[PDB]
Design a protein around this nucleic acid. Structure first.
Ligand SMILES: [Mg+2]
Ligand SMILES: [Mg+2]
Ligand SMILES: [Mg+2]
Lengths: 125, 282, 46, 59, 59, 40, 49
RNA sequence: UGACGGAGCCAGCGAGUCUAACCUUGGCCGAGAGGUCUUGGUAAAAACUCCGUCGUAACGAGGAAUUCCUAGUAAGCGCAAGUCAUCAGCUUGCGUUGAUUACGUCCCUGCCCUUCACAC
C-alpha cells in the first residue's frame, strides 16, 4: 500500500483534514492548488510551513487538504495547522525521527500554533 | 472530569430510584419499631416476613437540606456568576450589577458570544456554585434563571414590577455585609425547595448585629424581594428600602443545569388546566 | 381589576358548594345508615 | 388570530380571556397586535393548525 | 416517519447507529444485464402479487 | 367572560405597608431564616 | 444609605415610592398613591354595578 | 474609510400529513348550497476580496451632566427559532470579523476585618 498519513487542524468551527502520502510534490486545497487559496492577503500565511522547512521536503510527497466550516481566517489557520501536522506525522512514520525533530523544532520556534491548537477557552474571573 | 461527572450523575440517579423502592421498606421498619416500643401486634404481612425480622437486628441502629446542597451546606461559601443574554441593553447590564451586589459572593461576567455549553463548562471548571442569567424586554427585566452546579437544579423565574436602584436619585452606595434572610409564607414542599435554592446563594453565618436584611415574601406564588437597612431604636425598629423591588414567580424547575434542555423536569407551571386559578402551589 | 374579582368570587362559590354537598351526603350516611344498621340487626335477632 | 375583533381597543378589553379551538386546545388572549387593527397574539397548550377555528365563549 | 438529526446520528454508540442506505444513481451493470421475462410471465407475476395482496389484507 | 389566569398583583401603598410591618416584626423579634455555619 | 439614615435619625432623635426624572437642562409622580386611588375609584364603581 | 454594477467565496443553530394574505372587475354551471375560470389594486448569509464607472421647515454624528465596560471582552455583520411564565412596537439562540487600554495602588471615594517548633 502507498504510505499515507492523516491529520486534522482546527480553528473555531473551521476544520481541515490533510492527507499526506508519497508523491511528486502536489499540494492541493479543496481540489485546487494551494496557490489559489483566498483571501490573497493571507495567502502567505498558508505558505508559512512550506517556506519555513523548505520546498525540498515536499518534493517527495503529495498533500490533499479538505476544509469545512468557519470563515476565511479560521479556515486559513486550519489549513496551515493541518499541513504542518501532516508533514511532521509523515516524517515521523516513513522517514527518520531526526528530521521529525528538526521539523518540530523549526515549527515551534516560528509559531507553536502550527502544531498545537490555539483554543481560547473561557476563563471566569 | 467529564467521565467523573457523568458517572457521579448516574450513581446519583440510581441512588434515588432505589430510595423510592426503599421507602416502603423504611415504613415497614417504622411499624416494627413502634410495635416493639408499644407492644401492639404486628400486621399480617410483617408477621410472616422472616427476612425483614432478621434484617431488623442490623437495621435497628438507623436514624433536611436537599441532597444537592447537603454536601456543602454551611461549609463552603457559594461562588456565583451573574450574566445576561447576548447583546444586553444598558439597563439589563445595570440590573445585572444590582443582582451582583445583592449576593455577597457574586461576580458579573459579560456574555458576548459565549455559548451556553461553553459557559457552564467554564464555570464548572472554576468551582462556581451557581449561575444567574437575566433576560429583558426593551430594557425591562423579564426573567431570572438560577442554575446550581455541578448537576442542578435549574430554577427559572419571571420578574414583574421591577424598580431598579438606578431610577433613584442620590440613592448612594450599598452596604455589602453578609445580610440576614427572611423567608415568609413558604409552606408546601415546593416552597421549601425554592427556599433551599434561594438560601444557599448567600454566605453562612451573618453577624448578629448585621445591619442588612434581604426578605423573600411569598404572596400567592409571587415572591416579593426587598432589601432593607435597619437601626434598632429604643422603642422598636426603623427600616429603609435600599432596593431593587421586584416580584418573581416560579414557572419551571429542572433537575439539571440550564444547558441541558433534556433534563427531567421536577415541576412546571400548568396554565391551561381548567383548575389553574384555584390553587397556589408555593 | 374585573378579572381579579371574578376569579375570587368563582373560587369562593365553588368552595362553598363542595362543603355544602359534602355536608348533606355525610349527614345522610350517618343518620340513615344508623337506622339501616339498627333495623338490620333486629332482623338478624328475629 | 384574526377576525375575532375589529380594533385593538376591543382586544385589550378581552386580554387574558379564555379561548379554545374546535379541537379542544385551550389558550389565552395574550396581547393585541399593533398591525393590523383587531389582530392579536394567543398562546395554546399545543400547536394549532390553520384549519382550526378559535372560539371565545361569552354570555 | 421520524428523521433523526444528523448531528445526533453522527455521535451515536456503535450498538445503536441507524442504517440508512443511499439511493443509487449510476446504473449498475447487473441492473443493465438482468433479463425480465415478459408476456406470459408478466401475467403470471401480476397474478401472484394480487393474490398475496388479498391474503395479507384479509389476515 | 372567563379569565384563565389571575392578573399580576399591583404594588399599592397598602401592600407595601403590610410587607413592611412583617419585616419590622421579624427584626424586632430577631428571628431570621438564614444559613448557619456547620460545626467542624 | 444607612450612614445617611443613622445621621438623620440621630439628628431627629423610602425614596422608592418616587420616581425621579433626569434634568437635561426631580420628582415626577407617585406610583403607590396614584395606583391606589386609581384602583379604589374603580373598586367602588364595581361595587355600584 | 463613498454610491452603482459584475465576479469569487467562507458558517452554525433549526424539520409535527406541518408554514400560513386582503380588497375588486366579469364568464360559465348549479333549484339552492356553492364549484371553476377571468380580472385590476394594495400589503409582504452578511461581512470580506478583486475588477470597471462617477466623484468628495428639518438636518450635516449630537452640549452640560450621567452610566457601563478588562479577551475571543468592547464593537460590527448576518441567519435561524418563537419551546405552558415573558416576548413579535419584540424576545432568545447561532455563527462570522475582532481591537485599544489596565491587569498596579490603597493616594482620593465607599464597604469590610483586626487590635505545637525556629524566627519575629
Ligand atoms: Mg456587543
Ligand atoms: Mg444582532
Ligand atoms: Mg436582547
Amino acid at each position: 500500500a502507498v504510505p499515507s498519513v492523516q491529520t486534522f487542524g482546527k480553528k473555531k468551527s473551521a476544520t481541515a483534514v490533510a492527507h499526506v502520502k508519497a508523491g511528486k510534490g502536489l499540494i492541493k486545497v479543496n481540489g485546487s492548488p494551494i496557490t489559489l487559496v483566498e483571501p490573497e492577503i493571507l495567502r502567505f500565511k498558508v505558505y508559512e510551513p512550506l517556506l519555513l522547512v523548505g520546498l525540498d521536503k515536499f518534493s517527495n510527497i503529495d498533500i490533499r487538504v479538505r476544509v469545512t466550516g468557519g470563515g476565511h481566517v479560521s479556515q486559513v489557520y486550519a489549513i496551515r495547522q493541518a499541513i504542518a501536522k501532516g508533514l511532521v506525522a509523515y516524517h515521523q512514520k516513513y522517514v527518520d525521527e531526526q528530521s521529525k525533530n528538526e521539523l518540530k523544532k523549526a515549527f515551534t520556534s516560528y509559531d507553536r500554533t502550527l502544531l498545537i491548537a490555539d483554543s481560547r477557552r473561557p476563563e471566569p474571573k | 472530569m467529564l467521565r467523573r461527572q457523568a458517572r457521579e450523575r448516574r450513581e446519583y440517579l440510581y441512588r434515588k430510584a432505589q430510595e423510592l423502592q426503599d421507602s416502603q421498606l423504611q415504613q415497614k421498619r417504622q411499624i416494627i419499631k413502634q410495635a416493639l416500643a408499644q407492644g401492639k401486634p404486628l400486621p399480617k404481612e410483617l408477621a410472616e416476613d422472616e427476612s425483614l425480622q432478621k434484617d431488623f437486628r442490623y437495621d435497628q441502629s438507623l436514624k433536611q437540606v436537599d441532597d444537592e446542597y447537603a454536601a456543602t451546606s454551611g461549609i463552603m461559601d457559594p461562588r456565583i456568576i451573574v450574566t445576561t443574554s447576548r447583546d444586553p441593553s444598558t439597563r439589563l447590564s445595570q440590573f445585572a450589577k444590582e443582582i451582583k451586589l445583592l449576593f455577597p459572593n457574586a461576580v458579573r461576567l459579560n456574555r458576548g458570544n459565549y455559548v451556553m455549553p461553553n459557559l457552564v463548562d467554564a464555570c464548572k471548571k472554576s468551582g462556581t456554585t451557581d449561575l444567574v442569567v437575566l433576560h429583558e424586554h426593551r430594557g425591562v427585566p423579564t426573567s431570572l434563571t438560577i442554575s446550581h452546579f455541578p448537576h442542578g437544579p435549574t430554577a427559572q423565574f419571571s420578574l414583574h414590577n421591577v424598580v431598579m436602584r438606578h431610577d433613584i436619585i442620590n440613592a448612594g452606595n450599598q452596604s455589602e455585609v453578609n445580610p440576614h434572610l427572611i423567608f415568609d409564607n413558604f409552606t408546601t414542599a415546593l416552597g421549601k425547595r425554592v427556599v433551599c435554592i434561594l438560601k444557599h446563594l448567600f454566605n453562612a453565618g451573618p453577624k448578629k448585629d448585621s445591619e442588612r436584611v434581604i426578605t423573600f415574601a411569598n404572596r400567592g406564588d409571587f415572591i416579593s424581594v426587598r432589601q432593607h437597612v435597619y437601626v434598632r431604636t429604643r422603642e422598636g425598629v426603623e427600616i429603609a428600602e435600599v432596593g431593587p423591588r421586584f416580584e418573581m414567580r416560579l414557572f419551571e424547575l429542572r433537575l439539571g443545569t440550564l444547558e441541558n434542555k433534556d433534563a427531567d423536569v421536577e415541576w412546571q407551571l400548568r396554565r391551561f388546566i381548567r383548575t389553574a386559578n384555584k390553587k397556589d402551589y408555593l | 381589576f374585573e378579572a381579579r374579582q371574578r376569579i375570587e368570587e368563582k373560587n369562593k362559590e365553588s368552595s362553598d358548594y363542595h362543603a355544602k354537598m359534602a355536608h348533606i351526603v355525610n349527614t345522610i350516611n350517618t343518620e340513615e345508615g344508623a337506622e339501616k344498621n339498627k333495623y338490620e340487626r333486629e332482623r338478624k335477632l328475629r | 388570530i384574526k377576525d375575532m375583533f375589529s380594533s385593538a381597543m376591543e382586544v385589550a378589553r378581552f386580554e387574558g380571556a379564555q379561548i379554545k379551538t374546535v379541537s379542544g386546545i385551550r389558550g389565552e388572549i395574550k396581547r393585541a397586535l399593533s398591525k393590523p387593527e383587531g389582530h392579536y397574539r394567543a398562546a395554546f397548550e399545543d400547536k394549532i393548525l390553520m384549519s382550526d377555528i378559535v372560539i371565545l365563549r361569552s354570555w | 416517519g421520524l428523521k433523526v438529526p444528523k448531528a445526533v446520528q453522527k455521535e451515536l454508540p456503535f450498538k445503536s447507529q441507524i442504517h440508512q442506505m443511499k439511493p443509487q444513481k449510476k446504473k449498475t451493470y447487473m441492473a443493465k444485464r438482468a433479463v425480465v421475462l415478459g408476456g406470459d410471465e408478466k401475467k403470471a407475476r401480476s397474478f401472484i402479487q394480487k393474490v398475496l395482496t388479498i391474503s395479507k389484507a384479509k389476515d | 367572560f372567563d379569565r384563565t389566569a389571575k392578573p399580576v398583583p399591583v404594588i399599592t401603598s397598602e401592600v407595601t405597608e403590610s410587607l413592611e410591618d412583617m419585616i419590622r416584626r421579624r427584626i424586632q423579634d430577631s428571628n431570621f431564616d438564614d444559613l448557619q455555619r456547620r460545626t467542624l | 444609605q444607612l450612614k445617611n439614615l443613622k445621621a438623620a435619625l440621630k439628628a431627629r432623635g423610602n425614596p422608592f415610592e418616587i420616581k425621579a426624572a433626569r434634568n437635561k437642562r426631580i420628582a415626577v409622580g407617585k406610583p403607590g398613591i396614584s395606583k391606589q386611588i386609581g384602583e379604589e375609584q374603580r373598586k367602588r364603581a364595581f361595587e355600584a354595578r
